[PDB]
Amino acid sequence: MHIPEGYLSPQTCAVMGAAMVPVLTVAAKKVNKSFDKKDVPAMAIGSAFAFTIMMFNVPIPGGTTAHAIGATLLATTLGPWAASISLTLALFIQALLFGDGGILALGANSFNMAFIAPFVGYGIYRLMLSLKLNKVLSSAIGGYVGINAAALATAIELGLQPLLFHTANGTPLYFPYGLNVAIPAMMFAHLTVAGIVEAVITGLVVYYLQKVDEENILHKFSYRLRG
Numbered sequence: 623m624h625i626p627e628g629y630l631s632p633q634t635c636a637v638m639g640a641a642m643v644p645v646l647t648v649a650a651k652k653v654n655k656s657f658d659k660k661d662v663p664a665m666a667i668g669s670a671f672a673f674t675i676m677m678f679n680v681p682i683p684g685g686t687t688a689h690a691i692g693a694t695l696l697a698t699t700l701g702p703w704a705a706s707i708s709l710t711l712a713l714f715i716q717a718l719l720f721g722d723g724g725i726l727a728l729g730a731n732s733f734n735m736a737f738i739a740p741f742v743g744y745g746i747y748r749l750m751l752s753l754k755l756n757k758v759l760s761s762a763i764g765g766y767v768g769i770n771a772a773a774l775a776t777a778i779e780l781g782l783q784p785l786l787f788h789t790a791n792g793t794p795l796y797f798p799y800g801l802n803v804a805i806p807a808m809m810f811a812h813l814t815v816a817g818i819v820e821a822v823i824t825g826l827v828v829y830y831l832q833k834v835d836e837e838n839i840l841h842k843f844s845y846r847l848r849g
């Protein structure tokens with residue numbers, strides 16, 4: 623869903639950066655509150671994992687691109703704040719080093735993929751947990767909803783462009799397609815294939831982490847001491 627350069631007005635870009643600033647500020651403090659030398663490495667690995675996942679994507683005509691993120695997976699494993707930092711970091715790398723996602727677009731994509739996706743996904747996850755679903759199932763479900771929410775947010779941001787930013791001739795200055803085009807394109811891509819991929823990946827890794835703990839008998843003694 624990464625939005626490229628020139629799709630959003632400088633004003634839109636500015637807005638999302640301003641909205642995203644407090645989010646990252648808070649995440650940092652929360653993370654800052656909870657350090658061992660070691661959770662920093664964790665963030666990096668997650669970040670590298672997400673980055674790698676995102677590299678597998680397809681164009682959506684009338685929208686941007688589609689791919690999975692691993693966002694809810696990160697929120698559920700690291701806590702959402704750390705995930706948002708991890709995720710923001712990956713997009714920043716993509717932007718500065720790969721021309722993938724606009725640099726001016728950093729505020730928007732992070733708002734979508736580093737804030738909305740992991741926070742929504744985490745919330746649905748917690749909700750499904752409260753409905754007594756196992757973590758695997760729950761996380762796959764959270765993953766689906768989180769990524770579709772991010773896609774929606776993207777679609778609304780693109781689709782609003784011709785409405786808000788146009789020439790005196792009615793000519794779109796940036797992204798040229800409306801909500802009528804953008805919502806269906808982005809949501810159809812994300813509600814069907816990509817969201818399934820996200821769910822399966824999130825669930826797969828959780829399952830895998832679940833039973834790895836579930837063994838090394840060592841674990842059953844030391845998990846009540848995790849402090």
Ligand code: NI
Pocket residue numbers: 623624625687688689
């Ligand atoms: Ni993207």
